[PDB]
Design a protein around this nucleic acid. Structure first.
Ligand SMILES: [Mg+2]
Ligand SMILES: [Mg+2]
Ligand SMILES: [Mg+2]
Ligand SMILES: [Mg+2]
Ligand SMILES: [Mg+2]
Ligand SMILES: [Mg+2]
Ligand SMILES: [Mg+2]
Ligand SMILES: [Mg+2]
Ligand SMILES: [Mg+2]
Ligand SMILES: [Mg+2]
Ligand SMILES: [Mg+2]
Ligand SMILES: [Mg+2]
Ligand SMILES: [Mg+2]
Ligand SMILES: [Mg+2]
Ligand SMILES: [Mg+2]
Ligand SMILES: [Mg+2]
Ligand SMILES: [Mg+2]
Ligand SMILES: [Zn+2]
Lengths: 217, 101, 132, 221, 25, 83, 129
RNA sequence: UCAAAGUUUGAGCUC
RNA sequence: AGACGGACCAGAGCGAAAGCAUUUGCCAAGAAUGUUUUCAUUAAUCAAGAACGAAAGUCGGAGGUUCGAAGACGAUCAGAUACCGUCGUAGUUCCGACCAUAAACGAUGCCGACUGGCGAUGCGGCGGCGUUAUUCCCAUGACCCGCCGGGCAGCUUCCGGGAAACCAAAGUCUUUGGGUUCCGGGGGGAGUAUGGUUGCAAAGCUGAAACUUAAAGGAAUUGACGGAAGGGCACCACCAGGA
């Protein structure tokens, strides 16, 4: 990942980042998230440096590969924004999903029915998933999490800087993670592009849903 | 035990303020502790103006207003039921509600 | 008042959730279904079960319910997600970019790009939310 | 009788591979199942009911008396546990207390006073501990002095096997629960105390999940 | 007796003790 | 730990966080073992060797752990010195 | 007014070491302090500090390691006979095996064990372990 | 848009 | 004629503290800021000693509008020498003389250092597209976006502490010592007595003992009660009525 042009970012991907508005952070700024910021605009939005976003991504590749048995990855999102994403990722990687309503005390209460004991976690948003974090103290769990400038860095061990607010940049970051996990092991060649489209990972609004069913009919 | 942080008043840098005579009582309350209400209001409110509007000569001639500023004492306020009791936790929520009422 | 007990309700959700197809809206028919498939000792229990099972079948026939994972819904989600448009929204002929991302890329290696446009500055400083 | 285990830790232990619970303390893994400890040390282990204490909250119907059990457990080398349970009747209350203690057993670090020849007998340094009001300082003592302390601290530190130790106390020892929690923190922070011994960098051995990932998955889902 | 009267009553008392001692002088 | 004769007496030498130099306890359930995959530089595939970094729980719950890690990588040449 | 420079500095470092801070700036540079650091350094408890000379009371930057539980001070500077040295080092330290009491002497700045070798009593400055 | 509202065998409660 | 200077009036400012708000003029001062201004240790805290110190009270004048201790009477009420009312004295106002007491509360002594944020604000200072008046530019004024010092406050978190209530201080404590004053050691008896001192008086200050007594208190939990509020029900409640 370091000092290696092979795994480095591409001109298409750079255009993808900017199109989502990944560089485009939030309005408020935590004093811990300074390292990731480039500069301020007029209109007051901080621009995230996408190469270092890239670097954190390659660190994700290293970590996911290091987890040898892929079943024991867990991938959570309560809100709908990352709901299709965690599913598509579990589909490709062979992981165990948690789709909405993370039942509290799942990791601690043994007798409770859904007692899963994974070795790694991937959250989409800390505030909405505070309950996993409080369990993630009681159990020895490492954690990846998509975090904005506002996001607080309690108990998070590897935050990934993106525009986790936007729909596109979010689904996109999940697509790139699934790619890199596959490319870093002996599966895919870098010559071809991956067939799957990032809009496959996307979230569709019910109005767009009625628009599709209406266009079908 | 300390019931409230500000002692039901706003005396942090100052030290003394002028007392006021209650309207319903005459109870002496420190102006800074005392409740302050700026009530401007139509000499005719809503039901009356519809009735009184019949009594006006000119079609749609504007009424002047009644620019009050009231101060009440505490025991009168709860009796007149302007303010309700709140819980220990809700007490810190010192934001007033929006402008629905 | 004719209100359903938890033994009534749980039984109706189990009946519609396990055999949505067998069930229907009318009580007296889907009653025959309920008495056949399920051995309800009392006729009152049978009939109540059937009447809440019926009205609930109409609820589902009217539409999809929130707090329940229907297998049919799982299939439609797989279908909807496989729905793909002709082209991705990310593929664009021209991408707008701010002067800071222009200056930062020009200092970085990625100086010249074909489909970029360093757009105008947002004039008129009114971004802060009013105080009070 | 037969403990058919569910957990990951439980199944690796059950297959008789992981030789000691020190290997688990090395990795800070939560010891939820009691049958592991009954597997390893069940023979030498010894219990002591410290006291029966009747709390009672008032009701319209008199007050509901319900007893609160304190239970010391422990083999005389290294390991000790502390179970506390409140219940309406003693058999279930004591059993569940005993399980909770067994769950919570911890090791004690022991060193040498003065001259290093021989085996470690006393406490290393002046350790303290507290809970609520009560504070209890443990002190190093030379060999053969005995445990200079109250019946109670004396009684536990024996169970852990700490022959010589001076003690100092302060506050309302009458809160017994607090006295036990504080002397328990004292003897816990003994293995959390940073001696120059440990300046030597740690060798990171392989985690038992890494070694045995295919076993638990093959044995169960 | 509230401290209001303890303090005030002791004041009425002190007046009585001073007079009684004066007549003896 | 040993006396003049040289005997290791303690039954188990505990782990010590690599970031703070603080000995991680027997009941630190916020503790960790991050195993980092090693890469075949040209190929981009797993070699076999890992790169473990252990962290105390405390600095985690304070929140400066991810910066600490970024420092470890960039110090050990994992992250660009250019960055 | 500021009386004890050393007394402020050593608190500042203990409130750093509790927070695991990595390097520390201390604002008044004294010669006694400097001797003190060099004593702990030769014996390996900390790394290589560096001192910022201004034609003034200097500053000092300590790159801190993590082996220091506490580094304390004794004000007032008590005289210490060889009779009292054992009672001091008993009551003032964790154990008979480790930990040190550093006292400056006519002979020079040195540990108490070195004072035991050299047969030299003196004025207690402070301690660390 | 505030007039008021007092007591209760000595003859046995309780972990 | 004498009080009073509303509304503008803020979780704002200044003052050693009580406290300080109608216009204009005179007198001097000061915290804070900028400073490559002078001297070069001149400093911090303090028994003894001293200045100031709301209201009531007191002594003289001056003034006596309102209110209003005391007091009277009229009302309710078993009683009310009170709460309600009509009158109404001293006092309430100014000048000149005493006095030194309040929950005089942040119930938190003064200096000095260190360890998290976040937005807002007041002052002085600095920098920076553009709007907007001076209009015709400059350089000022009002906005606007920032940085700096200390300042009244606010929010915030497993920093850690603390019996808890809570505190970025009530932290840096059995890992106990940066400097220095004052002051407490079971409840009552009692801030009484006796002595001393001050004051016209009121009273202030210093300040004991006998004897009696096994408990007095704090925070927080669950009840029970509430002539405190919010929800909901009932013809042994009401409502509508009936024997
Ligand atoms: Mg009454
Ligand atoms: Mg009687
Ligand atoms: Mg006026
Ligand atoms: Mg005052
Ligand atoms: Mg004095
Ligand atoms: Mg006066
Ligand atoms: Mg006066
Ligand atoms: Mg007079
Ligand atoms: Mg009157
Ligand atoms: Mg009368
Ligand atoms: Mg009257
Ligand atoms: Mg006072
Ligand atoms: Mg002390
Ligand atoms: Mg006493
Ligand atoms: Mg008695
Ligand atoms: Mg009745
Ligand atoms: Mg009715
Ligand atoms: Zn009132």
């Amino acid at each position: 990942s370091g000092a290696l042009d092979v795994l480095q970012m591409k001109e298409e991907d750079v255009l993808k980042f900017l199109a989502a508005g990944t560089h485009l952070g939030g309005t408020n700024l935590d004093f811990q998230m300074e390292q990731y910021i480039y500069k301020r605009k007029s209109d007051g939005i901080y621009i995230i440096n996408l190469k270092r976003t890239w670097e954190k991504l390659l660190l994700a590749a290293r970590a996911i590969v290091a987890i040898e048995n892929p079943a024991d990855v867990s991938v959570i999102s309560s809100r709908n924004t990352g709901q299709r994403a965690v599913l598509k990722f579990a589909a490709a990687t062979g992981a165990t999903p948690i789709a909405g309503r993370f039942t509290p005390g799942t990791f601690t209460n043994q007798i409770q029915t859904a007692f899963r004991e994974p070795r790694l976690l991937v959250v989409t948003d800390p505030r909405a998933d505070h309950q996993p974090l409080t369990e993630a103290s009681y159990v020895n769990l490492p954690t990846i999490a998509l975090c904005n400038t506002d996001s607080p860095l309690r108990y998070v061990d590897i935050a990934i800087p993106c525009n986790n607010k936007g729909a596109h940049s979010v689904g996109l970051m999940w697509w790139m993670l699934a790619r890199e996990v596959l490319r870093m092991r002996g599966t895919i060649s870098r010559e071809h592009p991956w067939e799957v489209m990032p809009d496959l990972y996307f979230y569709r609004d019910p109005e767009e849903i009625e628009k599709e069913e209406q266009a079908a009919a | 035990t300390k019931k409230r942080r500000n002692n039901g008043r706003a005396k942090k840098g100052r030290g003394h303020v002028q007392p006021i005579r209650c309207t319903n009582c005459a109870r002496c309350v420190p102006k800074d502790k005392a409740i302050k209400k700026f009530v401007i209001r139509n000499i005719v409110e809503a039901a009356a103006v519809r009735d009184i509007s019949e009594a006006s000569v000119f079609d749609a001639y504007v009424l002047p207003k009644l620019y009050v500023k009231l101060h009440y004492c505490v025991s009168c306020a709860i009796h007149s039921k302007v303010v309700r009791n709140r819980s220990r936790e809700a007490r810190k929520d010192r934001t007033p509600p929006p402008r629905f009422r | 008042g004719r209100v359903r007990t938890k033994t009534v309700k749980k039984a109706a959700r189990v009946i519609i959730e396990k055999y949505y197809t067998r069930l229907g809206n009318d009580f007296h028919t889907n009653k025959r279904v309920c008495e056949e498939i399920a051995i309800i000792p009392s006729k009152k229990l049978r009939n109540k079960i059937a009447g809440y099972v019926t009205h609930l079948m109409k609820r589902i026939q009217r539409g999809p319910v929130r707090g329940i994972s229907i297998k049919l819904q799982e299939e439609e989600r797989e279908r909807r997600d496989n729905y793909v448009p002709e082209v991705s929204a990310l593929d664009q002929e021209i991408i707008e970019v701010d002067p800071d991302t222009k200056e930062m890329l020009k200092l970085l290696d990625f100086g010249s790009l074909s489909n970029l446009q360093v757009t105008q500055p947002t004039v008129g400083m009114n971004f802060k939310t009013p105080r009070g | 009788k037969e403990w058919l285990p569910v957990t990951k830790l439980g199944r690796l232990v059950k297959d008789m591979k992981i030789k000691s619970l020190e290997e688990i303390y090395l990795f800070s893994l939560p010891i939820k199942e009691s049958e592991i400890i009954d597997f390893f040390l069940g023979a030498s282990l010894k219990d002591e009911v410290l006291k029966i204490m009747p709390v009672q909250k008032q009701t319209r119907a008199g007050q509901r008396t319900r007893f609160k059990a304190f239970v010391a457990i422990g083999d005389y080398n290294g390991h000790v546990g502390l179970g506390v349970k409140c219940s309406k009747e003693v058999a279930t209350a004591i059993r569940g207390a005993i399980i909770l203690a067994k769950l919570s057993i911890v090791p004690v670090r022991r060193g040498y006073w003065g001259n290093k020849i021989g085996k470690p007998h006393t406490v290393p340094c002046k350790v303290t501990g507290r809970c609520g009001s009560v504070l209890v300082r443990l002190i190093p003592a030379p060999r053969g002095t005995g445990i200079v302390s109250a019946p109670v601290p004396k009684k536990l530190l024996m169970m852990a096997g700490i022959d010589d130790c001076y003690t100092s106390a302060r506050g309302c020892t009458a809160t017994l629960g607090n006295f036990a929690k504080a002397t328990f923190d004292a003897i816990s922070k003994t293995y959390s105390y940073l001696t120059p011994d440990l300046w030597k960098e740690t060798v990171f051995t392989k985690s038992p999940y890494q070694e045995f990932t295919d076993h638990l998955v093959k044995t169960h889902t | 007796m509230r401290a209001k009267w303890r303090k005030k009553r002791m004041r009425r008392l002190k007046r009585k003790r001073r007079k009684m001692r004066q007549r003896s002088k | 730990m040993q006396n003049d004769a040289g005997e290791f007496v303690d039954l188990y030498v505990p782990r010590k966080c690599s970031a703070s130099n603080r000995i991680i306890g027997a009941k630190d359930h916020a503790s960790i073992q991050m195993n980092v995959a090693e890469v075949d530089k040209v190929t981009g595939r797993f070699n076999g060797q890992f790169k473990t970094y252990a962290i105390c729980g405390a600095i985690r719950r304070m929140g400066e752990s991810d910066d600490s890690i970024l420092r470890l990588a960039k110090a050990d040449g994992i992250v660009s010195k250019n960055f | 007014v500021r009386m004890n420079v050393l007394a402020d500095a050593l608190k500042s470092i203990n409130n750093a070491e509790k927070r695991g801070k990595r390097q520390v700036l201390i604002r008044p540079c004294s010669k006694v302090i400097v001797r003190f650091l060099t004593v702990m350094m030769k014996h390996g408890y900390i790394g290589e500090f560096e001192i910022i000379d201004d034609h003034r009371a200097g500053k000092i930057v300590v790159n801190l390691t993590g082996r220091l539980n506490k580094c304390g001070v004794i004000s007032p500077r008590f005289d210490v006979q060889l009779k009292d040295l054992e009672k001091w080092q008993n009551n003032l330290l964790p154990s008979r095996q480790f930990g040190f009491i550093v006292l400056t002497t006519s002979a020079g700045i040195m540990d108490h064990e070195e004072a035991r070798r050299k047969h030299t009593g003196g004025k207690i400055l402070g301690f660390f372990f």
